[PDB]
Amino acid sequence: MKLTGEVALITGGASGLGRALVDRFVAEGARVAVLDKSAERLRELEVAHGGNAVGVVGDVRSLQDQKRAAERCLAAFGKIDTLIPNAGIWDYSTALADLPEDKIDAAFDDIFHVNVKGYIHAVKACLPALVSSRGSVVFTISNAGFYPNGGGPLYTATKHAVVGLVRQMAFELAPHVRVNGVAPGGMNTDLRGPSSLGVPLADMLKSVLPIGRMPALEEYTGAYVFFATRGDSLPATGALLNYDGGMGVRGFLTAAGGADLPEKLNI
Amino acid sequence: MKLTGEVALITGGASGLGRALVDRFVAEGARVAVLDKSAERLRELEVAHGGNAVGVVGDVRSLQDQKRAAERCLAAFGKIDTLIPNAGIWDYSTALADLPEDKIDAAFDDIFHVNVKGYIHAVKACLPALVSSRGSVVFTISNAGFYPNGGGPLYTATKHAVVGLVRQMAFELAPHVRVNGVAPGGMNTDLRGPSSLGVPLADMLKSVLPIGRMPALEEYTGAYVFFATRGDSLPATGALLNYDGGMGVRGFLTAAGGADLPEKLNI
Amino acid sequence: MKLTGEVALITGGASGLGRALVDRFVAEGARVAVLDKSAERLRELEVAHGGNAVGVVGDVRSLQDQKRAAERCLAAFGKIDTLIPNAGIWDYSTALADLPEDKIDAAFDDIFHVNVKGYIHAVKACLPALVSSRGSVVFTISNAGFYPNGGGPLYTATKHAVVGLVRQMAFELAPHVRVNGVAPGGMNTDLRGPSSLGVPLADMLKSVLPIGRMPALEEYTGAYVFFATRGDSLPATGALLNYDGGMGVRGFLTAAGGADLPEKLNI
Amino acid sequence: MKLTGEVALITGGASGLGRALVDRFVAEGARVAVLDKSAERLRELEVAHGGNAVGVVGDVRSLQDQKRAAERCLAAFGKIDTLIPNAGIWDYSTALADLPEDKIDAAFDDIFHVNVKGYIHAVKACLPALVSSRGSVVFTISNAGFYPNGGGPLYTATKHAVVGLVRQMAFELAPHVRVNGVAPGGMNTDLRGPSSLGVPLADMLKSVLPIGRMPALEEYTGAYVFFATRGDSLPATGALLNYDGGMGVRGFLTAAGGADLPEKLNI
Ligand SMILES: NC(=O)c1ccc[n+]([C@@H]2O[C@H](COP(=O)([O-])OP(=O)(O)OC[C@H]3O[C@@H](n4cnc5c(N)ncnc54)[C@H](O)[C@@H]3O)[C@@H](O)[C@H]2O)c1
Ligand SMILES: NC(=O)c1ccc[n+]([C@@H]2O[C@H](COP(=O)([O-])OP(=O)(O)OC[C@H]3O[C@@H](n4cnc5c(N)ncnc54)[C@H](O)[C@@H]3O)[C@@H](O)[C@H]2O)c1
Ligand SMILES: NC(=O)c1ccc[n+]([C@@H]2O[C@H](COP(=O)([O-])OP(=O)(O)OC[C@H]3O[C@@H](n4cnc5c(N)ncnc54)[C@H](O)[C@@H]3O)[C@@H](O)[C@H]2O)c1
Ligand SMILES: NC(=O)c1ccc[n+]([C@@H]2O[C@H](COP(=O)([O-])OP(=O)(O)OC[C@H]3O[C@@H](n4cnc5c(N)ncnc54)[C@H](O)[C@@H]3O)[C@@H](O)[C@H]2O)c1
């Protein structure tokens, strides 16, 4: 019940991690506005959280649809405390040599407009409200914003670019608006890619994830609730939380190094 | 109450951030065991929190002291869920040039034994318990573990060394024990030093903290509660949470970049 | 002469750092092909360096232009050993708030196509050659790829995005092609911007550069020579060389910390 | 021939990487002073480089032996341009659960005194000369200063601590002395450990090193020559070069991702 009386705006929140955030935020007593391209999923989200959540049909690439979202949130809930730019697009982990010449330009535009420009526009549109509420921006990043092999050249670059947005916007919006970033990873997603283009579980636990399990979307919502809590994260700005099961602390031969511990410590 | 039923062991928790963490963890429904060398201040928290806080007097540099703290935590509460190695000493930001040639060796030992060895000895002492509970470690680092001018060569090195403890212990203790770091910064505590040695934050704020204010000790507890909440931080291990008012994302001329922002929007 | 027999392709090398790199690489015994949109300045270096430098006029945003540069390099010199994507555009450090709502979309495309896509298209065009020679890529990043206030949201994001290109391309092109980044900082160049938009470094030095001086363009070439020397940088891939006069290690009050050091030692 | 007329002091340079640096530096026309505990190897080094190199028998843990080294270098060569604190001790990659209780204290003291305090004392002793020569410090670090599994809790912490020394000393010694760090890895070493304590090639190339080979000590010397070159690294201070074959950019399942490239690009 950390988010009583708090109002969030979450982009791309009609499915996947975005939807999980909505469901959790509403359950934490928050009021949530969602900008997404999916009309029928937005209405589905609205009836699932009657009164607490409102959906606005639009494109995150459009600044005017971002403004419509910010305007609709203010109209319905009076304020915007926390902004979660979350809408993202994958590149099917396509390598540079595997990107066809005749498709490489449009693929760049698509992935960068949704992944970076969408985040730029979202903060731009909600800025007046966030300065008024003295709130915070929590960007959804990725392990592909810190490490390779979590996407091709396109997705990795877009996700490293939002890390730059975390740092720059934290500087720019201070002392009024705090800007932080969560970088999730090792999820179970129905994440899609551009129209221009087109790891086994056993290998994922032994070599990719030290934690030795692939958590559900619900387990990735806690990080956002923390950043959106009124009195829990005031000192936090420019913060980067790697939330990927330990992809950056994985070992050379095996992901984890303490699987023997229980029977080594005689428990 | 978010930590109901949980048990924490915090070192250096009789004053400053540590005490604030004790207060907050008890208030959140958890039970806290505290290792500190200050006898008077351990009694102070004992009467304050009743049976929910046990104070064990000892030095963090001593392993058998650390083990005695782990014993008492198990005897009083039955388990250990979250270990918070927090006990730390400062070097007054004494430069290498200002370090006396006869005081340097003893000052190196003093600061590294508490700041790094005491962090090692705590995990070592609590390892069988934390493995049993599938619990987690949360190190108190500092801005001095990431950027210079937080302390001198000694303090900076020690706080950088615990960053190494975060990464190595996150690998070594996986999959059962998650290991994370919080790095507080804008604090204003009576952080003491070595008896082998001899500018206020407020006087320099607009060059240090983009957040534009000085957060209370209480405001730094939320990050630890997060890493202590099992249903909120499961996919987090090896994570480094910069919690320093944005010291690492400050500007060149001034710390914050948007002093004249509310007038650009007419708020 | 350290680069005798080697062949380099540098983009944006008709002025500033790029030209300095051309000058230095030719002086070190190598032969340089240059891609730039400035026709006059490409002629200027052609007469200066004789047959050892070929200028190809084109846009880095265009892949077939990039391929035409790779063709001409092979036609003139027979191979490509070191590719230096360097062509870059600035945003005048224009804040998100100061970005017009009608100029933002076109400014995003302008800056990201040159700064990120032009870096992608260069490697893509030169990949068959660099794989053939077991050569290496060296990206020109910036302090804005690591810390804020180097540019606005756009430039910072782009320069952070190339950091992602370093990491992903270092993985994708291994074991045959090493991929590294240099990040210059204390430069003083006529770094232009997008035609969709409208404080000197010297005026702010003691807050910016710990080195206490402004290095000439020539002084920034040595890092690239290093990554271009096969017998000197073989174990280097994915390396990020901060080359910014120490912007990331500056103090809070002043950039440098030992102004009064020679008197503490009586020098 | 980059180092003509340059004078270096390198600690622990009687064997391994240190010795390789001496041999290379002398071959680059540099004059080298070496502080090491091995008397017979120092004299062996001296006769191998007659006139250009001078050896001083002492302990890096001793500040007075560091002062003797700095004094002997000045006496023989008149100046100290570059200091390379290189003397280090491994921990046989011993995990925390594998460190015996009765040995953990002395092991900490030994590894931290050589690895961190030695570096502290070296800079301390050469400081007067380095301010006079306006030179630079180049610390030898390790991949274990950035990533886990390159050592146990002890070695990883010591190597992360020197990264802190790079950042702090770069701040402290500016604008006169530049402070940088090289972090080598994937070497072929006879590196030893403490008396308290006590990866196959195929697995090392497929999972550990993207470059797909284990280079000789000679290939790791180039990075140091760059930092010690008079006019090649003036803008460089606080710089961290990961020089480990790409350990930090390695993939999830395989170290490299472009082994198919040659026959994919039809060469
Ligand atoms: N796949 C993974 O495991 C993984 C790893 C790291 C990071 N992430 C990040 O998680 C975040 C959310 O992922 P998800 O699982 O919800 O993906 P998803 O595809 O399930 O959901 C994405 C949502 O964004 C909306 N959307 C996409 N483009 C839009 C546009 N242009 N305008 C408006 N709406 C748009 C879609 O309608 C969809 O509802 C993304 O930013 C992704 O980069 C995922
Ligand atoms: N002071 C700041 O602004 C600041 C900034 C960043 C990080 N920190 C970190 O905060 C952490 C908590 O300390 P604090 O800031 O509250 O300072 P503090 O001095 O108020 O608290 C330190 C506690 O550690 C205990 N302690 C010290 N040495 C001990 C030993 N050898 N054995 C047992 N107990 C010992 C002390 O009794 C005290 O209760 C420290 O690790 C410090 O590095 C402080
Ligand atoms: N200005 C600074 O102080 C500073 C600081 C850090 C990093 N940098 C980086 O240095 C790099 C080199 O640029 P510079 O500083 O010499 O500035 P510059 O403007 O002098 O050089 C840029 C060159 O790129 C060429 N160019 C620009 N757009 C092009 C295009 N679309 N197609 C082909 N060529 C194009 C220009 O003709 C010019 O010759 C840039 O990537 C910049 O981001 C500069
Ligand atoms: N093993 C690897 O592949 C690896 C990986 C990363 C980093 N490194 C680093 O490389 C550096 C050099 O390694 P190396 O191969 O030369 O090791 P080495 O054991 O071959 O050489 C170390 C030298 O240091 C000297 N020395 C040690 N302790 C001393 C003391 N207290 N006083 C004086 N001299 C002392 C020894 O006499 C020896 O000559 C070390 O700092 C090590 O941490 C090695």
Structure tokens at D184: 């080598």
Structure tokens at B246: 């944005």
Antiparallel, parallel or unpaired: β D136-140 and D82-84: parallel
Structure tokens at D94: 């011993």
Cβ atoms within 10 A of the Cβ of C179, count? 29
Intra-chain end-to-end CA distance of chain B, in Å: 36
Q: Which among B68, B229, B212, B19 is positioned nearest to B136, based on CA atoms?
A: B229
* Spatial distance between the Cα atoms of B79 and B81, rounded to a whole number of angstroms: 7
Deposited experimental method: X-ray
Q: Note the Cα C246 to chain centre separation in Å.
A: 17
Cβ atoms within 10 A of the Cβ of C126, count? 27
- Cβ(D215)–Cβ(D186) below 8 Å: yes
Antiparallel, parallel or unpaired: β B31-36 and C178-184: unpaired
Q: Which among C42, A14, A99 is positioned nearest to A23, based on CA atoms?
A: A14
* Spatial distance between the Cα atoms of D87 and D75, rounded to a whole number of angstroms: 22
* Spatial distance between the Cα atoms of A263 and B71, rounded to a whole number of angstroms: 20
- Cβ(C212)–Cβ(C256) below 8 Å: yes
Candidates B21, B23, B35, B36: which one to mutate for ligand 2, based on the most atoms within 8 Å of Cβ? Answer: B36
Question: In sequence order, which ranges of chain B are alpha helices (DSSP H)?
Answer: 16-27, 39-49, 63-77, 104-112, 118-133, 153-172, 205-208, 222-228
Structure tokens at D143: 């991949």
Instruction: List b or e across A142-173, with b for residues whose CB sees 16 or more CB atoms inside 10 angstroms.
Output: bbbbbbbbbbbbbbbbbbbbbbbbbbbbbbbb
* Minimum CA distance residue for ligand 2 atom 8: B142
Is the Cβ atom of D52 under 6 angstroms away from ligand 4? no
List, comma-separated, the residues after which chain A is broken, a break being a C to N distance over 2.5 A; otherwise answer none.
198
- Cβ(A21)–Cβ(A83) below 8 Å: no
* Minimum CA distance residue for ligand 3 atom 17: C191
Dihedrals φ, ψ of B243, to 5°? -135, 50
Q: Which domains, from first to last, does chain C contain? A: 1-267 (3.40.50.720)
**Min Cα separation B179/chain D (Å):** 13
Q: Which of A127, A165, A167 to mutate to test the interface with C (most CBs of C within 10 A)?
A: A167
Q: Which among B187, B158, B183 is positioned nearest to B20, based on CA atoms?
A: B187
- Beta strands per DSSP E along chain A: 7-11, 31-36, 53-57, 82-84, 136-140, 178-184, 240-243
- Cβ(D53)–Cβ(D26) below 8 Å: yes
As a whole number of Å, the CA-based R_g of chain C is 19
Structure tokens at A220: 């990735």
Starting at the earlier edge strand, list the strands of the sheet with A82-84.
Answer: A53-57, A31-36, A7-11, A82-84, A136-140, A178-184, A240-243
Dihedrals φ, ψ of C79, to 5°? -160, 170
Q: Which of 178-237 (B) contact D at CB < 8 A?
A: none
- Cβ(A52)–Cβ(A31) below 8 Å: yes
A215: which residues sit within 8 A by CB, 6+ positions away? A186, A187, A245, B234, B235
D200: which residues sit within 8 A by CB, 6+ positions away? none
* Spatial distance between the Cα atoms of A230 and A181, rounded to a whole number of angstroms: 17
Q: Is the peptide bond before D175 cis (omega within 30 degrees of 0)?
A: yes
Q: Which among A168, A178, C95, A132 is positioned nearest to B262, based on CA atoms?
A: A132
Final resolution, Å: 2.5
**Helix count and strand count (H, E) for chain B:** 8, 7
With 0-12 / 13-18 / 19 or more C-beta atoms within 10 angstroms meaning exposed / middle / buried, residue B125 is: buried
Cβ atoms within 10 A of the Cβ of B204, count? 13
Interface contact D159, partner B, CB < 8 A: yes
Q: Report helix, strand or coil for A178.
A: strand
With 0-12 / 13-18 / 19 or more C-beta atoms within 10 angstroms meaning exposed / middle / buried, residue D132 is: middle
- Cβ(D34)–Cβ(D54) below 8 Å: yes
* Spatial distance between the Cα atoms of A117 and C161, rounded to a whole number of angstroms: 13
Cβ atoms within 10 A of the Cβ of B259, count? 14
Question: In sequence order, which ranges of D28-152 are alpha helices (DSSP H)?
Answer: 39-48, 63-77, 104-112, 118-133
Residues of D in contact with B63 (CB under 8 A): 101, 104-105
Interface contact C147, partner A, CB < 8 A: yes
Residues of B in contact with D147 (CB under 8 A): 167
Identity (one letter) of the amino acid at B74? L
H or E stretch including D159? helix D153-173
* Block residue for tokens 């006059």: C40
* Spatial distance between the Cα atoms of B1 and B24, rounded to a whole number of angstroms: 10
What letter does residue D9 receive in the DSSP assignment? E
Antiparallel, parallel or unpaired: β B136-140 and C7-11: unpaired
Interface contact C147, partner D, CB < 8 A: no
Identity (one letter) of the amino acid at B48? A
* Spatial distance between the Cα atoms of D164 and D139, rounded to a whole number of angstroms: 11
- Cβ(D47)–Cβ(D40) below 8 Å: no
Dihedrals φ, ψ of D81, to 5°? -85, -50
* Block residue for tokens 């843990």: D61
- Cβ(A179)–Cβ(A227) below 8 Å: no
Is the Cβ atom of C8 under 6 angstroms away from ligand 3? no
What letter does residue B36 receive in the DSSP assignment? E
Chain C residue with Cα closest to B256: C149
Q: Which of D63, D120, D162, D168 to mutate to test the interface with B (most CBs of B within 10 A)?
A: D168
Which one of the listed residues A155, A220, A224, A243 is annotated catalytic?
A155
Contact D153 B165 (CB under 8 A): yes
* Block residue for tokens 């240059």: C34
Q: Which of 26-65 (D) contact B at CB < 8 A?
A: 63
- Cβ(A192)–Cβ(A90) below 8 Å: yes
* Spatial distance between the Cα atoms of A159 and C161, rounded to a whole number of angstroms: 7
Antiparallel, parallel or unpaired: β B7-11 and B82-84: parallel
* Spatial distance between the Cα atoms of B124 and A265, rounded to a whole number of angstroms: 11
H or E stretch including C182? strand C178-184
CA dihedral over C173, C175, C181, C182, signed as positive or negative: negative
Dihedrals φ, ψ of B103, to 5°? -100, -15
Identity (one letter) of the amino acid at A222? G
What letter does residue D123 receive in the DSSP assignment? H
Q: Which among A8, A223, A199, A133 is positioned nearest to B225, based on CA atoms?
A: A223
